Coordinates of N, CA and C and ligand atoms in Angstrom, one line a residue:
X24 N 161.9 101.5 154.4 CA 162.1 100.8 153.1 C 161.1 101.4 152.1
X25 N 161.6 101.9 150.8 CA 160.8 102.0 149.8 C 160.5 100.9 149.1
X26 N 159.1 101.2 148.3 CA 159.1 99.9 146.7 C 159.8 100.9 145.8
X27 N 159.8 99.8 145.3 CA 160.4 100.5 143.3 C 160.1 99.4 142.0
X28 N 160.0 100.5 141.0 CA 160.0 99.9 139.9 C 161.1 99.6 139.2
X29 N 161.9 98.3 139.3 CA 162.9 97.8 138.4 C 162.4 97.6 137.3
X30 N 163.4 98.3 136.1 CA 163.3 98.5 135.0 C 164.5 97.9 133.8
X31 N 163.8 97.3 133.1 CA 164.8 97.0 132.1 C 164.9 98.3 131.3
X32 N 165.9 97.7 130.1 CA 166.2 99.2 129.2 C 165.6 98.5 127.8
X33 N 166.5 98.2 127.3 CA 166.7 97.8 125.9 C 164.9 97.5 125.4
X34 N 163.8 97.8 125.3 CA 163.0 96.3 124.5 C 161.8 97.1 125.8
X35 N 162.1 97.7 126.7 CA 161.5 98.4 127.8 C 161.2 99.7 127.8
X36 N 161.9 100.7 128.0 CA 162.4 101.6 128.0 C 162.4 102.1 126.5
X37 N 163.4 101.8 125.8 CA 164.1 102.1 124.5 C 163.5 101.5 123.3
X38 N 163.1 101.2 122.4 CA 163.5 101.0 121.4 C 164.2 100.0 121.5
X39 N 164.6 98.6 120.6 CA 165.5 97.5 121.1 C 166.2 97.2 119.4
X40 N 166.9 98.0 119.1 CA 167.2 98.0 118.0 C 169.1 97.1 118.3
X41 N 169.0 96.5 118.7 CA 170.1 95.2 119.0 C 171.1 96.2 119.4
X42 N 172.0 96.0 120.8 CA 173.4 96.6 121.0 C 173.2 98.2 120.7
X43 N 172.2 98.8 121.3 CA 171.9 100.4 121.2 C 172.9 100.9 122.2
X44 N 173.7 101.8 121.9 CA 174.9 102.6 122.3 C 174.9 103.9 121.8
X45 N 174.5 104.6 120.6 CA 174.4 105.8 120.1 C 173.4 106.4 120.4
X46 N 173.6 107.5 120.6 CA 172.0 108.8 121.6 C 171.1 108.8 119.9
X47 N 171.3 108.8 118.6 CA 170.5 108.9 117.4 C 170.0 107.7 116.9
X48 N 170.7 106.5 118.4 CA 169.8 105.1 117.9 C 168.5 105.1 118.7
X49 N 168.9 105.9 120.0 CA 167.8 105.4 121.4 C 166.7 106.4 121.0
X50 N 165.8 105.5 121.3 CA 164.1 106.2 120.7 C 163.5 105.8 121.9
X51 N 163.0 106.6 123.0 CA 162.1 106.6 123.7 C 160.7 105.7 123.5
X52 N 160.3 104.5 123.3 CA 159.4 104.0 123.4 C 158.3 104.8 124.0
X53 N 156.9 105.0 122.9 CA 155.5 106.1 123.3 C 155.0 105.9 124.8
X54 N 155.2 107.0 125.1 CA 154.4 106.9 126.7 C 154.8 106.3 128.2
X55 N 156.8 105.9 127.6 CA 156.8 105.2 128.8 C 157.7 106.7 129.6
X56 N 158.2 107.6 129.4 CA 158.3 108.8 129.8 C 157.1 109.5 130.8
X57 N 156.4 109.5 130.4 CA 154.9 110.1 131.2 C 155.0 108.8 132.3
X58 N 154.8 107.7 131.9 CA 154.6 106.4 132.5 C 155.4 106.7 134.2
X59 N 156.6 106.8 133.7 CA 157.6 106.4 134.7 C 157.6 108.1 135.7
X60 N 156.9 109.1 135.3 CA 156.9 110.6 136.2 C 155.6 110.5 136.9
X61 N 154.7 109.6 136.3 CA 153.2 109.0 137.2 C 153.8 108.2 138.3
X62 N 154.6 107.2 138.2 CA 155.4 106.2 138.8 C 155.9 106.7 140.1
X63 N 157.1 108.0 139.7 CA 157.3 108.5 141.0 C 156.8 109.5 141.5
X64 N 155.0 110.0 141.1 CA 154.4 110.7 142.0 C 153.3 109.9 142.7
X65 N 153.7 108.3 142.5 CA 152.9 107.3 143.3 C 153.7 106.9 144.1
X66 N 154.8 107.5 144.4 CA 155.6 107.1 145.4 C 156.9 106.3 145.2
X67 N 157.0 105.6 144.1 CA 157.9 104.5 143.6 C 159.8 104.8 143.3
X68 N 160.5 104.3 143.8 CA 162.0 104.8 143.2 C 161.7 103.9 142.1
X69 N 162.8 104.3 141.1 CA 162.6 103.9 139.7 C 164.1 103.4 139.7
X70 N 164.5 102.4 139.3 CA 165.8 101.5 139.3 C 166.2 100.8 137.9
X71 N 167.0 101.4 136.9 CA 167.2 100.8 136.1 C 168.1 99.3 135.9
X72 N 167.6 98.4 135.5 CA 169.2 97.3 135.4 C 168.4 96.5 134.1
X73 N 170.0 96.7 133.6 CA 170.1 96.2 132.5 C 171.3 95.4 131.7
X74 N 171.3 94.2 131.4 CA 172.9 93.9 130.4 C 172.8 94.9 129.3
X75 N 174.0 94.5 129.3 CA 175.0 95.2 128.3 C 175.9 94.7 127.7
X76 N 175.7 93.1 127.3 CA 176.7 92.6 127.0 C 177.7 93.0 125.5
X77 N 177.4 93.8 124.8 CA 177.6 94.5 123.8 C 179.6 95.0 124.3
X78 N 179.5 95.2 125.3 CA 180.3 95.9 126.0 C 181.4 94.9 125.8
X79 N 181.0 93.6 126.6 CA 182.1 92.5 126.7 C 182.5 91.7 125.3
X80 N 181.4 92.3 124.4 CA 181.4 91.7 122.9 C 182.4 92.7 122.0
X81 N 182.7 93.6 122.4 CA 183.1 95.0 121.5 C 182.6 95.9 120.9
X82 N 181.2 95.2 120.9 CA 180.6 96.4 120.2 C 180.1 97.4 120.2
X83 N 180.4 98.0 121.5 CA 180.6 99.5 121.6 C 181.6 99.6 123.1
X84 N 182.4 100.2 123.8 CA 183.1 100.7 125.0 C 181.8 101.1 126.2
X85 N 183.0 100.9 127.7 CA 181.9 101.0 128.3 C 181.6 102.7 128.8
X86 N 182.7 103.5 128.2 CA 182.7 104.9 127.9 C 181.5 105.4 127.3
X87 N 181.5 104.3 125.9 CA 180.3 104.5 125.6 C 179.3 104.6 126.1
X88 N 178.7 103.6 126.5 CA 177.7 103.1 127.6 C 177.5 104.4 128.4
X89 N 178.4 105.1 129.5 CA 178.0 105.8 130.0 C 177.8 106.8 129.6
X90 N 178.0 107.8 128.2 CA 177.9 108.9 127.8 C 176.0 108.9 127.6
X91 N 176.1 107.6 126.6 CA 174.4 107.3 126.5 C 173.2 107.4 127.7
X92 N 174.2 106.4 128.5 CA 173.5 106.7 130.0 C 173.1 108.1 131.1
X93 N 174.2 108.6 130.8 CA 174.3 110.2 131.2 C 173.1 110.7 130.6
X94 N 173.0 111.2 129.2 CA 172.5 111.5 128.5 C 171.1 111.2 128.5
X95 N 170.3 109.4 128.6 CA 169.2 109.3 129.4 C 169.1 109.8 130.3
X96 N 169.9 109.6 131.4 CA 169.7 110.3 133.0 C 169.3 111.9 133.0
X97 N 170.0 112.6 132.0 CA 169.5 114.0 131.8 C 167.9 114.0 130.8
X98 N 167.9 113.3 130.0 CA 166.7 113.7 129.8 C 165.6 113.3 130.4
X99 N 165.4 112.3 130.8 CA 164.1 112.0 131.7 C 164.6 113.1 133.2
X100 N 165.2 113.3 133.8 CA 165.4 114.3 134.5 C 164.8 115.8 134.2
X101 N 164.9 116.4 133.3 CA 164.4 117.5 132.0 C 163.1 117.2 132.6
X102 N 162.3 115.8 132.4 CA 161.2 115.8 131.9 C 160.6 115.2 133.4
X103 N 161.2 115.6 134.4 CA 160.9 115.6 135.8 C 160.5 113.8 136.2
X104 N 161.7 112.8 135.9 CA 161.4 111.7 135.9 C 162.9 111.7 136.5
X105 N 163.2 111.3 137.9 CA 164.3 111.3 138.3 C 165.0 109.9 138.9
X106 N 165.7 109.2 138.1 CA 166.1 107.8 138.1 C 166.7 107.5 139.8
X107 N 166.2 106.7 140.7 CA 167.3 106.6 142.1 C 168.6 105.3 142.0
X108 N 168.4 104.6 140.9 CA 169.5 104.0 140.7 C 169.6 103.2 139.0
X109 N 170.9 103.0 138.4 CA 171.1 102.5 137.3 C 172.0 101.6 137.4
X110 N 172.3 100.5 137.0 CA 172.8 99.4 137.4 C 172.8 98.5 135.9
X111 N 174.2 97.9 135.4 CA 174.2 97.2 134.5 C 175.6 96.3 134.7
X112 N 175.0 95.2 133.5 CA 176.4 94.0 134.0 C 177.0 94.2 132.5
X113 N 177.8 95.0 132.1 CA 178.9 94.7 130.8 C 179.6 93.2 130.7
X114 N 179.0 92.1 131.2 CA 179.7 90.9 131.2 C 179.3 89.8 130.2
X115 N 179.9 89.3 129.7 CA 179.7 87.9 128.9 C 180.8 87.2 129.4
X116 N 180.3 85.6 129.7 CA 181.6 84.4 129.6 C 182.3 84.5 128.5
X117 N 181.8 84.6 127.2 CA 182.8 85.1 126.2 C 183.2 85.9 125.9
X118 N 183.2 87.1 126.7 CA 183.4 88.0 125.8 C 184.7 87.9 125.1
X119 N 185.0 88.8 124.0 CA 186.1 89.4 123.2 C 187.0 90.5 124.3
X120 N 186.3 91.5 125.1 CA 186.7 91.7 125.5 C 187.6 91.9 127.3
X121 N 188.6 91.1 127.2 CA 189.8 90.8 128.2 C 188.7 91.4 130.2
X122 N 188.8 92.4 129.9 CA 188.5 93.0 130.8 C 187.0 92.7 131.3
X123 N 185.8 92.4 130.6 CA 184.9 92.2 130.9 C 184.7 90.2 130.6
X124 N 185.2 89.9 130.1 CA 184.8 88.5 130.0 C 185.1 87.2 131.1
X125 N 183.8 86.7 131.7 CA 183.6 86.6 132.7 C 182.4 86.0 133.0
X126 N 181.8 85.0 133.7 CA 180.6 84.7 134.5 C 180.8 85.6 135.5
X127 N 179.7 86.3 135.8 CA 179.1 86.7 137.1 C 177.7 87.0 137.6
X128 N 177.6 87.7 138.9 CA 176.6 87.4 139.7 C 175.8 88.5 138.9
X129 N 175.8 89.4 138.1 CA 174.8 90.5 138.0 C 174.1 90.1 136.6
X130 N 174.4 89.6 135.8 CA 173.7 89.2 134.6 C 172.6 88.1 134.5
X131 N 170.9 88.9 134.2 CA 170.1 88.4 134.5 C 170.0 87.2 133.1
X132 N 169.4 86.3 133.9 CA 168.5 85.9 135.3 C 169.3 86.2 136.4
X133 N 170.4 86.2 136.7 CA 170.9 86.5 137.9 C 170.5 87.6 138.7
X134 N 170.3 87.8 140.1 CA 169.6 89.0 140.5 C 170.4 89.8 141.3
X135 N 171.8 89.5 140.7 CA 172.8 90.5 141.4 C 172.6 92.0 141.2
X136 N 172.2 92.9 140.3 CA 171.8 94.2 140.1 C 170.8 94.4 141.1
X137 N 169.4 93.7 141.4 CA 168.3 94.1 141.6 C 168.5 93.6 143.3
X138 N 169.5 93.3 143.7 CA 170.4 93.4 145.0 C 171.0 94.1 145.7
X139 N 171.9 94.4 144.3 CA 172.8 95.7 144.7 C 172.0 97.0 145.4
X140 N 170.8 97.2 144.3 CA 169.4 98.2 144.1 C 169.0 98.5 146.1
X141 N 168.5 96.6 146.1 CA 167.7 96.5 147.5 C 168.6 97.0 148.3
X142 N 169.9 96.4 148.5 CA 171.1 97.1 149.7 C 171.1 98.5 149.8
X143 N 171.0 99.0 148.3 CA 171.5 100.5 148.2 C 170.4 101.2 148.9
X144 N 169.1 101.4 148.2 CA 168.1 102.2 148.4 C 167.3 101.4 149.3
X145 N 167.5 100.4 150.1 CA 166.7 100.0 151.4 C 165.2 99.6 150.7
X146 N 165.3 98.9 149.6 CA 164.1 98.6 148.7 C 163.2 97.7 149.3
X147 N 162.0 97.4 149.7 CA 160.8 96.6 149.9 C 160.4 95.9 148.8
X148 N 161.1 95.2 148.8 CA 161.2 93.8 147.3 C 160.2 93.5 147.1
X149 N 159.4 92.8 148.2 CA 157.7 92.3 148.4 C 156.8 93.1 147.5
X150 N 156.8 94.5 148.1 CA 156.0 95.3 147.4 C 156.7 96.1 146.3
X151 N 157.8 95.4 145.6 CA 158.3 95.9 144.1 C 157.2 95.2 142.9
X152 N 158.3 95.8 141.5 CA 158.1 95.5 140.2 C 159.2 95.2 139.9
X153 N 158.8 94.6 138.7 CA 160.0 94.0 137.4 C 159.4 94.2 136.5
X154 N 159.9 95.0 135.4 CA 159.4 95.3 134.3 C 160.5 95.0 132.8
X155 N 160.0 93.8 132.4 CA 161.1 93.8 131.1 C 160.5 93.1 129.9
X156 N 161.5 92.8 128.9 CA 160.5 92.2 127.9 C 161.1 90.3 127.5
X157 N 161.7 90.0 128.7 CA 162.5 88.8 128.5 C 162.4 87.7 129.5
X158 N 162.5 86.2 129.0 CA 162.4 85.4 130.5 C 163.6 86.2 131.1
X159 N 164.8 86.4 131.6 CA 165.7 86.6 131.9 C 165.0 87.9 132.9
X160 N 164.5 88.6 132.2 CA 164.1 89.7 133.4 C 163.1 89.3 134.7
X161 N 162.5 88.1 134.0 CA 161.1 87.2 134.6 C 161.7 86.9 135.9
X162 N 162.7 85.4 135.4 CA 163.9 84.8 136.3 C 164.1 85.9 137.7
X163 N 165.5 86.8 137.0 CA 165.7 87.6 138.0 C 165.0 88.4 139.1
X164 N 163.8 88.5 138.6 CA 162.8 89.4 139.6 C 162.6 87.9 140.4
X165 N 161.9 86.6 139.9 CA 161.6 86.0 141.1 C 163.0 85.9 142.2
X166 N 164.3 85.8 141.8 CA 164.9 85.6 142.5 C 165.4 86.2 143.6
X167 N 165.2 87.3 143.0 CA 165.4 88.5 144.0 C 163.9 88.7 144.8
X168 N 163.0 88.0 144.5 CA 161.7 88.6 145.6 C 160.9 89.6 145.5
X169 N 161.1 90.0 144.1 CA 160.6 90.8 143.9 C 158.8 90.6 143.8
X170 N 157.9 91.4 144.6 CA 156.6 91.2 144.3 C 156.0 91.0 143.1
X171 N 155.9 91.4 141.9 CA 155.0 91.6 140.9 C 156.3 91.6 139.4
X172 N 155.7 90.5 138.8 CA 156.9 90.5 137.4 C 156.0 90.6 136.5
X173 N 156.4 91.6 135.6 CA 155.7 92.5 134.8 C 156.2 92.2 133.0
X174 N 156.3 91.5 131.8 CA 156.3 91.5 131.0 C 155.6 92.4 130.2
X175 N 156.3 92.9 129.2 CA 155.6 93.6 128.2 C 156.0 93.7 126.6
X176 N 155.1 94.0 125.6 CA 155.2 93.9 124.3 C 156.0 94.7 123.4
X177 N 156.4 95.9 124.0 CA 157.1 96.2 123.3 C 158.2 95.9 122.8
X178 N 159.5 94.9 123.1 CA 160.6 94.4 122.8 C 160.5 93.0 121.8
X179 N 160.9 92.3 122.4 CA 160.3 90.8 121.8 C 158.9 90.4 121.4
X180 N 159.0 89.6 120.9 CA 157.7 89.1 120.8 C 158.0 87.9 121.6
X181 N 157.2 87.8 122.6 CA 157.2 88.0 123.9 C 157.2 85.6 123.7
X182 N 157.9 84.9 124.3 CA 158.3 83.6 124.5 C 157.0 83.3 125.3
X183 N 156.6 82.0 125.0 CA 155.5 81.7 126.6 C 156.7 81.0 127.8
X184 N 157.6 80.7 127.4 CA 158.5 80.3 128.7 C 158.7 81.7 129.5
X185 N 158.7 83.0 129.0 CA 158.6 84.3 129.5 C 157.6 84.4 130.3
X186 N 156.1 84.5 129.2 CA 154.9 84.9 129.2 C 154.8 84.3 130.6
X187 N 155.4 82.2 131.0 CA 154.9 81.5 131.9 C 155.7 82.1 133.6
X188 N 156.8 83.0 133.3 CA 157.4 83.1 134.2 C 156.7 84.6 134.8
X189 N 156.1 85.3 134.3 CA 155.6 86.5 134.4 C 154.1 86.4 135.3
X190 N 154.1 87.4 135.7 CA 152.8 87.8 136.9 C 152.1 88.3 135.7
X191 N 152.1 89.4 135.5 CA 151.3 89.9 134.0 C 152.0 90.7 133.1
X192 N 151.1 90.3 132.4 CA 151.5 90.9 130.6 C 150.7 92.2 130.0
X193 N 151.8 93.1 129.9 CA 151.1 94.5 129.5 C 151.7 95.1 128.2
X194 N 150.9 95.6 127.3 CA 151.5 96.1 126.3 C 152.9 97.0 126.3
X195 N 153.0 97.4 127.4 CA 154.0 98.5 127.2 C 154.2 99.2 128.8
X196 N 155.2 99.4 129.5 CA 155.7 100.1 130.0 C 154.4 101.5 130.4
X197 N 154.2 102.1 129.4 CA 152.8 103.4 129.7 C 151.8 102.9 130.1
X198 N 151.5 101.6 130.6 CA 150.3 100.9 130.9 C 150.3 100.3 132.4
X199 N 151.9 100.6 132.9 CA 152.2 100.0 134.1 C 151.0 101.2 135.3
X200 N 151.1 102.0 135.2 CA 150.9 103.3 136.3 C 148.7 102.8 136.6
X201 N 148.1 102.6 135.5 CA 147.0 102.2 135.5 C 146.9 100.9 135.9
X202 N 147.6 100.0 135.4 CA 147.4 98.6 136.3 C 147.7 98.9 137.6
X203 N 148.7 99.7 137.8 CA 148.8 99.1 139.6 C 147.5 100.2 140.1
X204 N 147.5 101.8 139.8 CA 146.3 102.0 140.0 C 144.7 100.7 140.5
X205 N 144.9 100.3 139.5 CA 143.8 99.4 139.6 C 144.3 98.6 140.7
Ligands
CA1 CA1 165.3 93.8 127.2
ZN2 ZN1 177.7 91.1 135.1

């Protein structure tokens, strides 16, 4: 079994400029690129999950979604940061759109993604991360068992019902590699 770092996208990863779907909206947040190529030369798979409810809303296809996704996947790749799984729930109970509209098990808090993750890549949950900028990401990691729930600043301005569900609070994603160091 490996650990890994589960990763949110939007507010983590990106830039959280609401319903990001276009490659000229997604802006690499400073330093979490370097962050995450430290990550997996400490040994870590790197697991993305993320909603996307945007999808089930209309506001962008889930075509979409993947071209952007690809597109991530190639450049942190480029930049010798090689993702071992990506995982998102396009679902809303309301959505607008037919096809995706729907309760289900993978939209956090729910820990159906960070499940899927553990089944797939035989993940050591204990000795994971959860890295996001939301209670929802908080939730999800406890539920899944995940060891260490990681909050950070760059997305929201961060809730204490978050803040309260979180192991610790780090400015940003580029600051993960030195805490656990430590
Ligand atoms: Ca987020
Ligand atoms: Zn879902």
């Amino acid at each position: 079994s490996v650990p890994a770092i589960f990763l949110d996208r939007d507010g983590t990863i990106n830039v959280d400029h609401g319903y990001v779907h276009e490659i000229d909206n997604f802006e690499f947040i400073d330093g979490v690129i370097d962050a995450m190529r430290e990550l997996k030369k400490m040994g870590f798979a790197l697991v993305v999950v993320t909603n996307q409810s945007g999808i089930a809303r209309g506001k962008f296809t889930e075509a979409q979604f993947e071209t952007l996704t690809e597109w991530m996947d190639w450049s942190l790749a480029d930049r010798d940061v090689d993702l071992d799984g990506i995982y998102y729930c396009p679902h809303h109970p309301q959505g607008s759109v037919e096809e995706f509209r729907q309760v289900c098990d993978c939209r956090k808090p729910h820990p159906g993604m960070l499940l899927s993750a553990r089944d797939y890549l035989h993940i050591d949950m204990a000795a994971s991360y959860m890295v996001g900028d939301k209670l929802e990401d908080m939730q999800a990691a406890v539920a899944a068992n995940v060891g260490t729930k990681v909050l950070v600043r760059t997305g929201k301005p961060i809730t204490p019902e978050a803040e309260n569900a979180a192991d610790w609070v780090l400015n940003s994603l580029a600051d993960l590699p030195q805490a656990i160091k430590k």
